[PDB]
Amino acid sequence: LCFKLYAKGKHEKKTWFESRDFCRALGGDLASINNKEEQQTIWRLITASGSYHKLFWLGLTYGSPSEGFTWSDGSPVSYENWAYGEPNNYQNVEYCGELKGDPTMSWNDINCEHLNNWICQI
Ligand SMILES: CO[C@H]1O[C@H](CO)[C@@H](O)[C@H](O)[C@@H]1O
Ligand SMILES: [Ca+2]
């Protein structure tokens, strides 16, 4: 799959659901990061665009209480890169996952209604 970054204007950021709908409208989905190679590919896209110090939606969304986090594309949640202390369901309202687009490429759970940049796979 081909990853593409979407880091548009300050008033063009989207909720997790809006971002998923955007990627699905293209025939793809929000990006799943399934191994270190895919993580590197996305980091290099960040460096190439100069889109530094931004937060991006990934396809991380909570499933049932039993399952915990899932990928919207159905990929197994095997590789994980949560920041230390995450996921933490801070204030009990965090059911989607974002990428911190810095060299750590770490993940954080955050409120799904937050307006973020996003990454599609197509
Ligand atoms: C203050 O809340 C923010 O920072 C903490 C980590 O400090 C995250 O867990 C949380 O989802 C928010 O991004
Ligand atoms: Ca969190």
Author numbering: 640 to 761
Authors' text:
The binding of α-methyl mannose to CRD4 is revealed by four independent copies of this complex observed in three different crystal forms: two copies of the CRD in form αMeMan/1 and one copy of the CRD in αMeMan/2 and αMeMan/3. Each structure shows the same orientation of the bound sugar. Binding of mannose residues to CRD4 results primarily from interaction of the equatorial 3- and 4-OH groups with a conserved principal Ca2+ common to almost all sugar-binding C-type CRDs. As in other C-type CRDs, the main determinants of monosaccharide binding to CRD4 are a conserved principal Ca2+ and four of the five amino acid residues that surround it. The presence of glutamic acid and asparagine residues at positions 725 and 727 in CRD4 determines specificity for mannose, GlcNAc, and other sugars with equatorial 3- and 4-OH groups. In addition to the Ca2+ ligands, the side chain of Tyr729 makes van der Waals contacts with the bound sugar. The position of the aromatic ring of Tyr729 is established in part by interactions with the side chain of Gln730. The protrusion of the tyrosine and adjacent glutamine residue creates a barrier adjacent to the sugar residue. The importance of the interaction of the sugar with Tyr729 was demonstrated by changing this residue to alanine, which caused a fivefold loss in affinity for α-methyl mannose. Mutagenesis demonstrated that these changes in the spectrum were caused by the ring current effect from the side chain of Tyr729. These results are consistent with the orientation of mannose in the primary binding site seen in the αMe-Man crystals, which places C5 and C6 above the tyrosine ring.
The human mannose receptor expressed on macrophages and hepatic endothelial cells scavenges released lysosomal enzymes, glycopeptide fragments of collagen, and pathogenic microorganisms and thus reduces damage following tissue injury. The receptor binds mannose, fucose, or N-acetylglucosamine (GlcNAc) residues on these targets. C-type carbohydrate-recognition domain 4 (CRD4) of the receptor contains the site for Ca2+-dependent interaction with sugars. The mechanisms of binding to monosaccharides and oligosaccharide substructures present in many of these ligands were examined in multiple crystal structures of CRD4.
